[PDB]
């Protein structure tokens, strides 16, 4: 199809090379560049994709053929690396959290309008066939209206933590799993329902060495009234589900996230079921979809806006929204309160 | 065994039946009387289980042979049932929540300690062979440590609801189904955790014609720091689960509750699965469990202490912390806050 649209990757670390994996797959997309502090993490993910590596950000940004940044550095220098990069004309991914603070969000919605650059938060579950499919039956009400949702995101990550580790310090992980792990159900919740108008959320540190809460949860109120429960936690086996309650019939979600880096197959790791009347009789019946590659196509939507126009699924304000169900969440921990949305964003 | 104790039916709709269906197959029990304001009611039940009939409490609280009575009336008049009862010296069974009222409440534990006759207020999930081996996984540490819970107890009823019905009247069902269905849920929930500390719940009417709250999701903080969801809704097909999270393996549960009144084959119409390391490899593994009559084991139980001395598994005061959840989570809805349990309690 079109000229493929020019990439580099910034930030080298693991989550860098599960995206190249993917997308690199794309006609859609050439890397061209990458930058990383270290000079040898640079010197590894140019030989293993085979693209060049820039000693630094001017040199990447000086090159017009690269057209689009793929971020995949902390969440606090998220901030600063997309400013650089906007403002030399660069379109702009960057992974999930948007950020881990208001401040640092909300410098990236405004440059973001300042610049007028493509911009996406790469929160990728949404993508998957399930989440698609889920979304159809929602809204052309198949399962008639929905009441509720339950959403899960747990691992054991928590029991391992020992003391020092990044993930057990509050500010950089706010409410713990629920930045983490959290952020992506959030983001879910309201692809599925819309925006949320309040939380309230119980949480602290579990079966952990660490400082950080390692347990939540945390309840949602819609703008349109429909509510949600959302459990984050790092003490326990790996869980990711939804449910949803409709007045004609339920969906029960359960994804093995093991397979969430293998993204091309994730989907064939994962059972939706439907529970309806077959009324005064139930029956749960499974229900198939197509694999959707969430990591290759949301990079791909990217380089689609850029050649074509239009705006990405995903962008600064919504993203916002989800930092912000997380940041209401920690302030009614410490509150002992629920938390109005607009209480946090404005 | 012993000689059987003598039991008395007071109320006779439709859960008398279900009940009696189930405990007069005890060698532990014998059925003498019944009583309903309407003749009718005493006539058709006395004709089907072959017992007496009495035009009056006095009548049927006169017979010596009435030993224990079984009280299956409308919850508002629980207490003054029981007091009349108790107050003849006859030992109690009376089907769960003890009452709606907080008064009430307080009422029968008063009579009961004042009488000491022998108290059973009738939550019989918990003896379920499930619960049961639920609660010997968590005990033993099995699962390892427990850090969250979620109960869910939904069906359709609210979507059915024509305005005027009794289940559509806060005073008679507090929190819509958090009363006819949570309490059940409250009762498991602290039967494997112990005693709640403090609730926070969102609930309102939905898609329904009546007035009261039909859905509701509701959290728990224990009195150790545990935690715990309770979703509660009138507007989806029937969901019986509880998912419970310890440190080395999960247990998620479902029961179909339509097999409920089929007391000695209900567990067989369940399913308990562990999801545990097989680690870095998870295996889900079911488990299975002898079934147990929850209905007639816990009218037995009643019967073994009055022959053989002792206390039931569930007294007045637990029964009231059952209810006391109810009350604050309703308190939290109006308050717009999180609700001690001792707030309401005392």
Redesign the interface.
Same mark, same amino acid.
């Given at each position: 199809m079109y000229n493929p649209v020019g990439v580099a990757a910034i930030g080298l670390g693991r989550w860098a090379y599960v995206m190249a994996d993917a997308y690199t797959k794309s006609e859609k997309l050439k890397l061209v560049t990458c930058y990383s502090r270290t000079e040898d993490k640079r010197e590894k993910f140019g030989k293993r994709y085979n693209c060049a590596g820039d000693a630094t950000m001017e040199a990447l940004l000086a090159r017009e053929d690269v057209e689009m940044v793929i971020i995949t550095v902390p969440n606090d220098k998220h901030a600063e690396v997309i400013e650089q990069c906007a403002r030399s004309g660069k379109h702009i991914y960057v992974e999930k959290p948007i950020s881990v603070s208001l401040d640092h969000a909300q410098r990236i919605d405004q440059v973001i309008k300042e610049t007028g650059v493509k911009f996406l938060c790469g929160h990728s579950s949404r993508r998957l066939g399930a989440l698609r499919k889920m979304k159809e039956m929602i809204d052309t009400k198949e399962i008639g *209206?929905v009441?509720?949702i339950?959403a899960?995101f /747990?691992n *054991?990550r928590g029991?391992e933590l020992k003391k020092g580790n990044w993930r057990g310090e509050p500010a950089t992980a706010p409410g713990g799993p629920l930045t983490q792990l959290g952020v992506h159900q959030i983001d879910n919740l309201q692809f599925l329902l819309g925006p949320v108008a309040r939380v309230?959320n119980?949480?602290?540190p579990?079966?952990t060495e660490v400082e950080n809460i390692t347990?939540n949860?945390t309840?949602l *109120?819609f703008e349109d009234?429909k509510? @949600?429960?959302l459990?984050t !936690?790092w003490?326990?086996?790996?869980?990711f589900s939804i !449910?949803v309650?409709?007045?004609? @019939? !339920?969906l029960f979600y359960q994804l093995?996230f /093991?397979w969430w880096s293998n993204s091309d197959v994730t989907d064939e790791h994962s059972t939706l079921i439907k529970?309806?009347?077959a009324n005064r009789?139930?029956r749960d019946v499974k229900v198939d979809f197509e694999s959707v590659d969430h990591l290759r196509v949301e990079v791909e939507e990217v380089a689609d806006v850029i050649r074509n126009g239009g705006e990405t699924e995903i962008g600064a304000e919504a993203s916002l929204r989800n930092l912000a169900v997380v940041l209401a969440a920690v302030k009614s921990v410490h509150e002992?309160?629920?938390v109005e949305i607009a209480e946090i964003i404005g």
């Open positions: *209206e009441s509720s339950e899960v /747990s *054991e029991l309230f119980f949480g602290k579990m079966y347990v949860q309840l *109120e009234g509510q @949600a429960y459990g !936690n003490a326990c086996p790996g869980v !449910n309650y409709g007045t004609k @019939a !339920n093995d /093991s529970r309806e009347f009789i139930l002992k309160r629920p």
